[PDB]
């Protein structure tokens, strides 16, 4: 606005100067934080070693499924290895005495036929 300057220096390769126009009119870094950086590591090493113990989980549950199947399979084989030869040695004994029931009725039409000739050779 047409002002007057205050010359503030002249050296080899320059010159400065203020150019005041219309007067103004009056109106702790801390080192201890390196432990902050291994609290950051406090919470990573927690999270990662937990999506490790949540995962070293889905693992030996797989132990089950895998084998609590196998284990539930021979649960059948060695149920029906005797649902057989124990239902079938109840058979062997079951007939075998329906044969004897057959025959001891014979020695009885037979040890009856014998004693009534001892009754003929006496009449």
């Amino acid at each position: 606005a047409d002002m007057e300057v205050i010359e503030l220096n002249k050296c080899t390769s320059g010159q400065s100067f203020e150019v005041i126009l219309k007067p103004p009119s009056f109106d702790p870094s801390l080192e201890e934080i390196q432990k902050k950086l291994e609290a950051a590591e406090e919470r990573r090493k927690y999270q990662e070693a937990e999506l490790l113990k949540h995962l070293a989980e889905k693992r030996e549950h797989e132990r089950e499924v895998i084998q609590k199947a196998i284990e539930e399979n021979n649960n059948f084989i060695k149920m029906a290895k005797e649902k057989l030869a124990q239902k079938m040695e109840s058979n062997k004994e079951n007939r075998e005495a329906h044969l004897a029931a057959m025959l001891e009725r014979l020695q009885e039409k037979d040890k009856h036929a014998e004693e009534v000739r001892k009754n003929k050779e006496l009449k």
């Binding site: 044969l99 057959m102 025959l103 036929a113 003929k120 050779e121």
Partner: protein, 427 residues
């Protein structure tokens, strides 16, 4: 798989004779030698009824038991005489008596073991013996007495294998002996616990089929054996022939027998006569079916009316179409639908083998578990109790070595069988 044949008693034997020569014809066997015939099947299933010996030769698997020479040298002297192996003949020498006891107790057990000895041979030789069959009279000792003993002694030895008989229920009319009722009831008893199937053949029938249905005046034991000879070929065929059944004998039984007592197939036949009577070709399939289903053509004297068929087999003979057979078969199940039982479902099955008998181009044979058989049983038990009345002829069994109670003890066992067949007009 293989069957032996026991054939004991004048009545048993003279049936057995006629049987053998008729089946021996079908297969074609010289009175001695081997095959002579332009057919070729025959021999598939000849295995079953003929154990074959050295040279050509074919010899029946037969045992002939009698309690006196007489009738053994009838066969050996008659038709197909020297066909049977010489020491398959088990001689008697002694009395027979026309008495059950002699045959079942004294003079029978006297022999018996020598019979068991041939049978043991043949069957122990027989590569897979399936069972025995037997033929014999029921009124008269050597057949009905020895045989019922045989069978009892046959089992026990052979529990195992299935038993089977054509037995000739005796009538008051056309018989020799006053006592037969006694003889009958005593074996009837024996049978009903030891056989697996028993073809009931009444001589009341057999004779009636000749005068009612033949105009045959003087009916022999000849033309009359003739029927049985035929009917027996009938029943046997499909264990001994085609390859359209296959007929285990056991299978054959299982599917025929509901209840382990009551195996009393009264049988029947298609055509008939022998002498100066014919057939004007006219055996038709229809006229062949409503004929093995007419009572007046039944091998026992029942009347498969009052009383209902448990099971019913029929086998058909003659290069004819079975496209008609089942259709006719059905027809009768509808036409006489009433008198089958419901509770065993498909209880009348039939099959067909196409090679006819001596003479006759077409033919049907009927096996038949009718409770109307109760008719037959009740007929003998009927005249028996009229004799055990004030105990007549019994003193021949009294002193022989039999008890008083014993008659009643098996007179009873029959009375039960009676009202079990009656207790099978069911629901």
């Amino acid at each position: 798989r293989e069957i032996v044949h026991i054939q004991a008693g004048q009545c048993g034997n003279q049936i057995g004779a006629k049987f053998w020569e008729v089946i021996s014809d079908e297969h074609g066997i010289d009175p001695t030698g081997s095959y002579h015939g332009d057919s070729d099947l025959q021999l598939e299933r000849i295995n079953v009824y003929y154990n074959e010996a050295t040279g050509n030769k074919y010899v029946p698997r037969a045992i002939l038991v009698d309690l006196e020479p007489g009738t053994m040298d009838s066969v050996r002297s008659g038709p197909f005489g020297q066909i049977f192996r010489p020491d398959n003949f088990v001689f008697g020498q002694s009395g027979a008596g026309n008495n059950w006891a002699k045959g079942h107790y004294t003079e029978g057990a006297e022999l018996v073991d020598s019979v068991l000895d041939v049978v043991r041979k043949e069957s122990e030789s027989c590569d897979c013996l399936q069972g025995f069959q037997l033929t014999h009279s029921l009124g008269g000792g050597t057949g009905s007495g020895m045989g019922t003993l045989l069978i009892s002694k046959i089992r026990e030895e052979y529990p195992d294998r299935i038993m089977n008989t054509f037995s000739v229920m005796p009538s008051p009319k056309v018989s020799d002996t006053v006592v037969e009722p006694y003889n009958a009831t005593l074996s009837v008893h024996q049978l009903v616990e030891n056989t697996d199937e028993t073809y009931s053949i009444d001589n009341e029938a057999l004779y009636d089929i000749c005068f009612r249905t033949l105009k045959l005046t003087t009916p022999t034991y000849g033309d009359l054996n003739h029927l049985v000879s035929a009917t027996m070929s009938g029943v046997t065929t499909c264990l001994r022939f085609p390859g359209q059944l296959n007929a285990d004998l056991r299978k054959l039984a299982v599917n025929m027998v509901p209840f382990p007592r009551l195996h009393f197939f009264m049988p029947g036949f298609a055509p008939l006569t022998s002498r100066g009577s014919q057939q004007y070709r006219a055996l038709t399939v229809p006229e062949l079916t409503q004929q093995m289903f007419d009572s007046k053509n039944m091998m026992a004297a029942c009347d498969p009316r009052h009383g209902r068929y448990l099971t019913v087999a029929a086998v058909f003979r003659g290069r004819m179409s079975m496209k008609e057979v089942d259709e006719q078969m059905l027809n009768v199940q509808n036409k006489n639908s009433s008198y089958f039982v419901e509770w065993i479902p498909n209880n009348v099955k039939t099959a067909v083998c196409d090679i006819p008998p001596r003479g006759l181009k077409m033919s049907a044979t009927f096996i038949g578990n009718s409770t109307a058989i109760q008719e037959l049983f009740k007929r003998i038990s009927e005249q028996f109790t009229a004799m055990f009345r004030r105990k007549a002829f019994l003193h021949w069994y009294t002193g022989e070595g039999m008890d008083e109670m014993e008659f009643t003890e098996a007179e009873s066992n029959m009375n039960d069988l009676v009202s079990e067949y009656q207790q099978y007009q069911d629901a």
